[PDB]
Design a protein around this ligand. Structure first.
Ligand code: HEM
Ligand SMILES: O=N[O-]
Length: 151
Protein backbone atom coordinates (compact mmCIF):
# COMPACT_ATOMS: atom_id res chain seq x y z
CA UNK A 1 0.00 0.00 0.00
CA UNK A 2 1.32 3.39 -1.10
CA UNK A 3 0.66 6.37 1.13
CA UNK A 4 -0.95 9.55 -0.21
CA UNK A 5 2.41 11.25 0.02
CA UNK A 6 4.02 8.49 -2.00
CA UNK A 7 1.27 8.63 -4.69
CA UNK A 8 1.83 12.40 -4.81
CA UNK A 9 5.55 11.83 -5.47
CA UNK A 10 4.73 9.30 -8.18
CA UNK A 11 2.41 11.74 -9.99
CA UNK A 12 4.81 14.69 -9.59
CA UNK A 13 7.38 12.51 -11.37
CA UNK A 14 4.82 11.46 -13.94
CA UNK A 15 4.33 15.19 -14.69
CA UNK A 16 7.91 15.34 -15.94
CA UNK A 17 7.07 12.46 -18.38
CA UNK A 18 3.91 14.16 -19.61
CA UNK A 19 5.93 17.20 -20.78
CA UNK A 20 7.40 14.92 -23.41
CA UNK A 21 5.63 11.60 -23.56
CA UNK A 22 7.05 10.52 -26.93
CA UNK A 23 10.71 11.30 -25.86
CA UNK A 24 10.42 9.43 -22.63
CA UNK A 25 8.64 6.49 -24.24
CA UNK A 26 11.20 6.19 -27.00
CA UNK A 27 14.14 6.38 -24.51
CA UNK A 28 12.46 3.75 -22.32
CA UNK A 29 11.89 1.25 -25.17
CA UNK A 30 15.39 1.84 -26.52
CA UNK A 31 16.95 1.27 -23.07
CA UNK A 32 14.85 -1.93 -22.75
CA UNK A 33 15.83 -3.27 -26.14
CA UNK A 34 19.49 -2.52 -25.77
CA UNK A 35 19.83 -3.73 -22.11
CA UNK A 36 17.79 -6.84 -22.86
CA UNK A 37 17.85 -7.78 -26.56
CA UNK A 38 15.42 -10.74 -26.01
CA UNK A 39 12.66 -8.16 -25.42
CA UNK A 40 12.94 -6.69 -28.92
CA UNK A 41 12.29 -10.15 -30.30
CA UNK A 42 8.81 -10.06 -28.87
CA UNK A 43 7.86 -7.17 -31.19
CA UNK A 44 7.33 -8.30 -34.79
CA UNK A 45 6.64 -4.62 -35.27
CA UNK A 46 10.16 -3.56 -34.25
CA UNK A 47 12.51 -6.47 -34.57
CA UNK A 48 13.88 -5.10 -37.96
CA UNK A 49 15.62 -2.40 -35.89
CA UNK A 50 19.23 -3.36 -35.40
CA UNK A 51 21.08 -0.30 -34.19
CA UNK A 52 20.27 2.35 -31.62
CA UNK A 53 20.40 4.93 -34.47
CA UNK A 54 17.68 3.01 -36.31
CA UNK A 55 15.62 2.85 -33.17
CA UNK A 56 16.00 6.53 -32.45
CA UNK A 57 14.97 7.31 -36.06
CA UNK A 58 11.88 5.13 -35.91
CA UNK A 59 8.85 7.36 -35.73
CA UNK A 60 6.65 4.26 -35.30
CA UNK A 61 8.66 3.37 -32.17
CA UNK A 62 7.96 6.79 -30.77
CA UNK A 63 4.22 6.22 -31.59
CA UNK A 64 4.14 2.99 -29.64
CA UNK A 65 6.07 4.76 -26.87
CA UNK A 66 3.19 7.18 -26.57
CA UNK A 67 0.68 4.26 -26.52
CA UNK A 68 2.56 2.48 -23.73
CA UNK A 69 3.15 5.49 -21.46
CA UNK A 70 -0.45 6.76 -22.02
CA UNK A 71 -1.63 3.45 -20.61
CA UNK A 72 0.84 3.50 -17.71
CA UNK A 73 0.03 7.18 -16.84
CA UNK A 74 -3.68 6.37 -16.72
CA UNK A 75 -2.94 3.37 -14.45
CA UNK A 76 -0.76 5.45 -12.10
CA UNK A 77 -3.47 8.17 -11.78
CA UNK A 78 -5.79 5.43 -10.49
CA UNK A 79 -3.51 5.19 -7.41
CA UNK A 80 -3.88 1.43 -7.19
CA UNK A 81 -7.58 1.38 -8.09
CA UNK A 82 -6.72 0.05 -11.55
CA UNK A 83 -8.38 -3.37 -12.06
CA UNK A 84 -10.30 -2.12 -15.10
CA UNK A 85 -7.26 -0.76 -16.87
CA UNK A 86 -4.96 -3.59 -15.91
CA UNK A 87 -7.18 -6.55 -17.02
CA UNK A 88 -6.83 -5.96 -20.84
CA UNK A 89 -3.05 -5.46 -20.52
CA UNK A 90 -2.63 -8.69 -18.60
CA UNK A 91 -4.65 -10.60 -21.13
CA UNK A 92 -2.87 -9.25 -24.15
CA UNK A 93 0.60 -9.35 -22.62
CA UNK A 94 0.22 -12.89 -21.18
CA UNK A 95 -1.77 -14.59 -23.93
CA UNK A 96 -1.11 -12.74 -27.20
CA UNK A 97 2.25 -10.98 -26.98
CA UNK A 98 3.66 -13.65 -24.61
CA UNK A 99 5.67 -11.25 -22.40
CA UNK A 100 7.13 -12.84 -19.27
CA UNK A 101 6.64 -10.98 -16.01
CA UNK A 102 10.41 -10.69 -15.92
CA UNK A 103 10.28 -8.40 -18.90
CA UNK A 104 7.91 -6.03 -16.98
CA UNK A 105 10.61 -5.97 -14.34
CA UNK A 106 13.11 -5.00 -17.05
CA UNK A 107 10.87 -2.18 -18.39
CA UNK A 108 10.43 -0.90 -14.82
CA UNK A 109 14.23 -0.65 -14.44
CA UNK A 110 14.37 1.10 -17.84
CA UNK A 111 11.84 3.64 -16.54
CA UNK A 112 13.96 4.40 -13.47
CA UNK A 113 17.05 4.70 -15.66
CA UNK A 114 15.42 7.08 -18.15
CA UNK A 115 14.02 9.31 -15.37
CA UNK A 116 17.54 9.71 -13.91
CA UNK A 117 19.04 10.37 -17.33
CA UNK A 118 16.55 12.97 -18.35
CA UNK A 119 16.21 14.65 -14.92
CA UNK A 120 19.68 14.63 -13.29
CA UNK A 121 19.54 16.07 -9.75
CA UNK A 122 15.74 16.41 -10.10
CA UNK A 123 14.53 12.83 -9.41
CA UNK A 124 14.62 12.73 -5.64
CA UNK A 125 15.45 9.75 -3.43
CA UNK A 126 11.88 9.93 -2.02
CA UNK A 127 10.46 10.01 -5.57
CA UNK A 128 12.55 6.97 -6.58
CA UNK A 129 11.25 5.05 -3.63
CA UNK A 130 7.67 5.94 -4.42
CA UNK A 131 7.96 5.14 -8.19
CA UNK A 132 9.51 1.75 -7.30
CA UNK A 133 6.51 1.06 -5.05
CA UNK A 134 4.09 2.10 -7.85
CA UNK A 135 5.82 -0.12 -10.41
CA UNK A 136 6.00 -3.04 -7.97
CA UNK A 137 2.20 -2.75 -7.41
CA UNK A 138 1.61 -2.75 -11.17
CA UNK A 139 3.73 -5.87 -11.57
CA UNK A 140 2.17 -7.61 -8.55
CA UNK A 141 -1.35 -7.01 -9.90
CA UNK A 142 -0.47 -8.07 -13.43
CA UNK A 143 1.37 -11.18 -12.14
CA UNK A 144 -1.79 -12.27 -10.29
CA UNK A 145 -3.69 -12.20 -13.62
CA UNK A 146 -0.86 -14.14 -15.36
CA UNK A 147 -0.96 -16.81 -12.62
CA UNK A 148 -4.76 -17.02 -13.00
CA UNK A 149 -4.21 -17.88 -16.71
CA UNK A 150 -1.22 -20.27 -16.21
CA UNK A 151 1.54 -17.87 -17.41
C1 HEM B 1 4.71 -0.59 -18.41
C2 HEM B 1 4.55 -1.74 -19.10
C3 HEM B 1 3.75 -1.87 -20.32
C4 HEM B 1 2.66 -1.20 -20.74
C5 HEM B 1 1.89 -0.16 -19.90
C6 HEM B 1 2.35 -1.69 -22.04
C7 HEM B 1 1.25 -1.27 -22.78
C8 HEM B 1 0.88 -1.69 -24.03
C9 HEM B 1 -0.26 -1.26 -24.78
C10 HEM B 1 -1.33 -0.25 -24.34
C11 HEM B 1 -0.24 -1.93 -25.93
C12 HEM B 1 -1.30 -1.80 -27.03
C13 HEM B 1 -2.57 -2.54 -26.53
C14 HEM B 1 -2.34 -4.00 -26.21
O1 HEM B 1 -1.85 -4.81 -27.05
O2 HEM B 1 -2.71 -4.46 -25.06
C15 HEM B 1 0.93 -2.77 -25.93
C16 HEM B 1 1.29 -3.58 -26.96
C17 HEM B 1 2.40 -4.44 -26.97
N1 HEM B 1 3.20 -4.61 -25.90
FE1 HEM B 1 3.25 -3.63 -24.20
N2 HEM B 1 3.28 -2.60 -22.41
C18 HEM B 1 4.10 -2.78 -21.41
C19 HEM B 1 5.23 -3.61 -21.44
C20 HEM B 1 5.55 -4.47 -22.45
C21 HEM B 1 6.77 -5.19 -22.52
C22 HEM B 1 7.82 -5.21 -21.50
C23 HEM B 1 6.82 -5.86 -23.76
C24 HEM B 1 7.87 -6.78 -24.36
C25 HEM B 1 9.05 -7.03 -23.85
C26 HEM B 1 5.57 -5.57 -24.43
C27 HEM B 1 5.19 -6.00 -25.68
C28 HEM B 1 4.12 -5.50 -26.38
C29 HEM B 1 3.84 -5.95 -27.78
C30 HEM B 1 4.61 -6.98 -28.58
C31 HEM B 1 2.75 -5.28 -28.14
C32 HEM B 1 2.15 -5.29 -29.50
C33 HEM B 1 2.76 -4.13 -30.40
C34 HEM B 1 2.21 -4.15 -31.84
O3 HEM B 1 2.48 -5.05 -32.61
O4 HEM B 1 1.46 -3.22 -32.22
N3 HEM B 1 4.93 -4.67 -23.61
N4 HEM B 1 1.60 -2.60 -24.74
O1 LIG C 1 17.40 -0.51 -18.05
N1 LIG C 1 17.90 -0.91 -16.87
O2 LIG C 1 18.52 -0.06 -16.29
Amino acid sequence: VLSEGEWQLVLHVWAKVEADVAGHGQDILIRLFKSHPETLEKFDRFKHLKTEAEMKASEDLKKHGVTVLTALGAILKKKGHHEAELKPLAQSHATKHKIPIKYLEFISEAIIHVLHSRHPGNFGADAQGAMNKALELFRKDIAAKYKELGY
